Nucleic acid binder design. Structure first.
Ligand SMILES: [Mg+2]
Ligand SMILES: [Mg+2]
Ligand SMILES: [Mg+2]
Ligand SMILES: [Mg+2]
Ligand SMILES: [Mg+2]
Ligand SMILES: [Mg+2]
Ligand SMILES: [Mg+2]
Ligand SMILES: [Mg+2]
Ligand SMILES: [Mg+2]
Ligand SMILES: [Mg+2]
Ligand SMILES: [Mg+2]
Ligand SMILES: [Mg+2]
Ligand SMILES: [Mg+2]
Ligand SMILES: [Mg+2]
Ligand SMILES: [Mg+2]
Ligand SMILES: [Mg+2]
Ligand SMILES: [Mg+2]
Ligand SMILES: [Mg+2]
Ligand SMILES: [Mg+2]
Ligand SMILES: [Mg+2]
Ligand SMILES: [Zn+2]
Lengths: 210, 40, 95, 98, 133, 85
RNA sequence: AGAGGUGAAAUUCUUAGAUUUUCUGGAGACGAACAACUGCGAAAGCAUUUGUCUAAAAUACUUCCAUUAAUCAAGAACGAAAGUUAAGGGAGUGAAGACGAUCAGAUACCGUCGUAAUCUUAACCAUAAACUAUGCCGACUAGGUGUUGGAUGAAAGUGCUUCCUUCAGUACCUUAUGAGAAAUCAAAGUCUUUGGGUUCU
RNA sequence: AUCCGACUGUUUAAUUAAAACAUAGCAUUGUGAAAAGCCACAACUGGUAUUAACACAAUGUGAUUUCUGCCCAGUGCUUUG
């Protein structure tokens, strides 16, 4: 029955809005602390509502809350996705698509997967219907993707990796470094899965929220 | 034996016995949840 | 008899082709013989579409589309008129 | 492949060159300073190979652990018995040393 | 709740249309803490028309009334079509539900298709030779 | 000359026990009475002495193995897993 | 407070909380979209990533040998699905079987359950519209449009693409003082102007 | 040629040696342990056990071949609160 109280949700300072909604929960009862019901929830937000621009209307962001001050949750970063219709609009008949995945560890001892995707291009002076590639070229391209992901992700940090995800720099680097094998159209990071977190440390988490 | 006797060599009583039966009486299938051929 | 040069499908230089399943009746059909239709449709029609526009935040909204990629068997396809029966000379007219 | 290269080089030694296989032969050759190269099989017993490699270190000769067995090494030569160690005292037209 | 002036309260509506019935389920934006569920088959008695547009319209109106009474004013939409090994297109009630919700008085946030498609394909019902009519 | 068409080893059991049981016995006892490679000395002279002990006739090393063969696939797989790591 | 399912319904599950949403673990099979009148293999067949073995073309060649070849009774290797034996595994589908409907009847088509089987390892069986319903090797005879893999020669380049020529696969279109009973065929043509070699029926 | 039991084996010392019992093969049931399964003891304590699911304990059928259909209403056993 509705005897429930509302709380506020807040995002870390990488983004721009910092207050993206409210949630409900039932009042506390004997050995029902009402905060063991809130922590660990997962929230999925579009990221065009997180940064207030319609260009990034794909790229949903997963946020998970860990620490609760009196009426607020603080809801740090958890994952990524790509809004299916965008994926479906990128697949046409006459081309070939490349795909790869890898495992990586940051300097904070987080573990992730990254799941890239790519397609081929036209080189307009060709006047031929199809743009297929040979298997050996596909193998070379995939190896390049794996190596570039590993370097870029294991190099720096979790927060800097997240800041790197927003403008899609990894795709630019992969596309530039593979031009000599075969021209490639739009290259994206399709999905990030967080695989293991080191340990909850409240000072760091509240540092994310100034 | 509880199965002894008769003119035709049959048991004559259900052969699945309960967990609580005394020592001289627990002699068939002991507290069986199921009987017959297994099918999985 | 022998009413088609290709035998009703497009297979050459191969022994076996794996089958798929009809979207309407569940039947098994080899992949090179089913008729493939790829449809890009809208969530709602044009009248209910402009009701969603004026009840929407963001002041400039584009409804998403749907992608289906249906496949059919011969019987379940020509009963629904995706494909018709033609005359002898017209049977050879492709694209 | 290194195994194929060493197998090819051994046949040249067998056709042109001077060698003898067996443990007593190898110790006799290293003792007198006549050895150019020893080759021991991976299967060779533990206390045999230590003596082989100590004589070689004193006598300044190379060792080259073979990649095969008692049977593989004897089949590398044209022989129908197992070897487990041999010594080349005269490399022939081959370049097995370099 | 206690909203400030000029800022809205959002929920998530999960629409489910499956050629046999039509669900309308509204939670908060975490998935937990469900709020309303009318399911369409609670508005007729015929055991058919459960997937008709009229039943979906009535369900949507009931959802909107309860939502307004609770304090929610905006809605995100996630659309589903029962698509496991079964059919991949939504049923006849989805459009009626969407239009009734849009004309109800709520504000519509975002629209998404979330039908559970497999890359995997366990075997499908009614083995080869299909369903014969 | 060839003294037997089918039964081979199991001709000592005469006509008893049924034909399929004798077939399984033959399959097992072909493995049980064979000679195996001794990886320590290189000769093929390893023979079973008891239900789980194998001894080489030349170098006299004793190895613990299977019941009817010197090795079993389940142990081969585990050992290969560990060595790969 | 209903859910499933159907032309309409029943059987079935459900306040002891079904159906529905969200998260965390385990299990077995499968490998969508890309994907084509495209690739490989003697046929049966072969589609997630990486490594290690292992063969096979095709092209290039002023390399070596010098007739070592073609087809093959007997004989040998492999051989979809189902089926048999043993040990595992066992989600989904589901010969048998049991129910609920329609029907004059319905041991069926529709629906709810569901056993063997389907998957793995070690052995059997030797069959399919196992079909291009067209045996294998060699010679000759016509134009065009493509496409998969090499090589040669020339131009727009941020040693890469476009074009030309040529070899090897592979389709399609037009037309045959060529052929057929015709359908049709680039071989199913070069057959009363009848004989290049050879196995099977 | 027919019946029974597959075979070697065992039995009513002193009226019954068999088609009876045993047997390999097949199937079912219980149990992850010193607070467990089955069994002994008045109590203290013991057997299996110098054991550990390819193990110990409790039943039925009775080599190989080919098979093992329908019924959970009754009586038993067993699962949830
Ligand atoms: Mg009694
Ligand atoms: Mg009896
Ligand atoms: Mg075939
Ligand atoms: Mg019909
Ligand atoms: Mg290809
Ligand atoms: Mg089995
Ligand atoms: Mg099952
Ligand atoms: Mg079923
Ligand atoms: Mg199996
Ligand atoms: Mg035949
Ligand atoms: Mg034929
Ligand atoms: Mg003639
Ligand atoms: Mg007897
Ligand atoms: Mg006797
Ligand atoms: Mg007597
Ligand atoms: Mg007597
Ligand atoms: Mg008896
Ligand atoms: Mg017995
Ligand atoms: Mg019998
Ligand atoms: Mg009963
Ligand atoms: Zn030995």
């Amino acid at each position: 029955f509705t005897k429930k109280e509302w709380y506020d949700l807040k995002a870390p300072k990488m983004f721009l809005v910092r207050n993206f909604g409210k949630t409900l929960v039932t009042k506390t009862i004997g050995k029902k602390l009402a905060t063991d019901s809130l922590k660990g929830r997962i929230y999925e937000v579009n990221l065009a509502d997180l940064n207030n621009d319609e260009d990034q209307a794909h790229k949903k962001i997963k946020l998970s809350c860990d620490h609760i001050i009196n009426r607020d949750c603080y809801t740090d970063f958890c994952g990524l996705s790509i809004t299916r219709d965008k994926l479906c609009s990128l697949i046409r008949k006459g081309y070939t698509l490349i795909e790869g995945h890898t495992d990586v560890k940051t300097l904070d001892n987080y573990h992730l997967r990254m799941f890239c995707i790519a397609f081929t291009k036209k080189r307009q002076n060709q006047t031929k219907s199809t743009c297929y590639a040979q298997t050996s070229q596909i193998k070379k391209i995939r190896k390049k993707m794996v190596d570039i992901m590993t370097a870029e992700a294991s190099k720096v940090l979790l927060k800097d990796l997240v800041k790197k995800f927003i403008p899609e720099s990894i795709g630019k680097e992969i596309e530039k470094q593979c031009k000599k094998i075969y021209p490639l159209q739009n290259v994206l990071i399709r999905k990030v899965k967080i695989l293991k977190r080191p340990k909850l440390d409240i000072s760091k988490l509240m540092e994310l929220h100034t | 034996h509880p199965h002894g006797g008769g003119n035709h060599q049959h048991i004559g009583h259900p052969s699945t016995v309960s967990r609580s039966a005394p020592a001289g009486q627990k002699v068939g299938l002991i507290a069986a949840r199921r009987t017959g051929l297994l099918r999985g | 008899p022998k009413k088609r040069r290709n035998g009703g499908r497009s297979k050459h230089n191969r022994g076996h082709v794996n089958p798929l399943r009809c979207s309407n009746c569940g039947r098994c059909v080899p992949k090179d013989k089913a008729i493939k239709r790829f449809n890009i449709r809208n969530i709602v029609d044009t009248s209910a579409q402009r009701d969603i526009k004026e009840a929407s935040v963001y002041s400039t909204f584009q409804l998403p589309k749907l992608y289906i990629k249906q496949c059919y068997c011969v019987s379940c396809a020509i009963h629904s008129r995706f494909v018709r029966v033609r005359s002898r000379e017209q049977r050879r007219v492709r694209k | 492949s290194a195994g194929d290269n060493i197998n090819a080089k051994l046949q040249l030694v067998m056709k042109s060159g001077k060698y003898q296989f067996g443990r007593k032969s190898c110790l006799k050759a290293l003792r007198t300073g006549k050895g150019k190269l020893v080759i021991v099989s991976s299967n060779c017993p533990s206390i045999q190979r230590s003596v082989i490699e100590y004589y070689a270190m004193l006598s300044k000769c190379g060792v080259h652990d073979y990649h095969g067995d008692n049977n593989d090494l004897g089949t590398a030569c044209g022989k129908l018995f197992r070897i487990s160690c041999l010594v080349i005292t005269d490399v022939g037209d081959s370049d097995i040393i370099k | 709740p206690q909203p400030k002036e000029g800022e809205l309260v959002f929920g998530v509506a999960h629409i489910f249309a499956s050629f046999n019935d039509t669900f309308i389920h509204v939670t908060d934006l975490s998935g937990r803490e469900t709020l309303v569920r009318i399911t369409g088959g609670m508005k007729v008695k015929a055991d058919r028309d459960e997937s008709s547009p009229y039943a979906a319209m009535m369900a949507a109106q009931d959802v909107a009334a309860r939502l307004k009474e609770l304090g929610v004013t905006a809605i995100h939409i996630k659309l589903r079509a029962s698509g496991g090994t079964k059919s991949k297109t939504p049923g006849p009630g989805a459009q009626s539900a969407l239009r009734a919700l849009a004309r109800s008085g709520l504000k519509i946030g975002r629209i998404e298709d979330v039908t559970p498609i497999p890359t995997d394909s366990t075997r499908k019902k009614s083995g080869r030779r299909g369903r014969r009519l | 000359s060839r003294r037997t068409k089918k039964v081979g080893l199991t001709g000592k059991y005469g006509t008893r026990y049924g034909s399929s049981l004798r077939k399984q016995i033959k399959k097992i006892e072909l493995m049980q009475h064979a000679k195996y490679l001794c990886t320590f000395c290189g000769k093929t002279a390893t023979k079973r002495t008891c239900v789980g002990i194998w001894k080489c006739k030349k170098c006299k090393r004793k190895v613990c193995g299977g019941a009817w063969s010197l090795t079993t696939p389940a142990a081969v797989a585990a050992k290969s897993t560990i060595i790969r790591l």
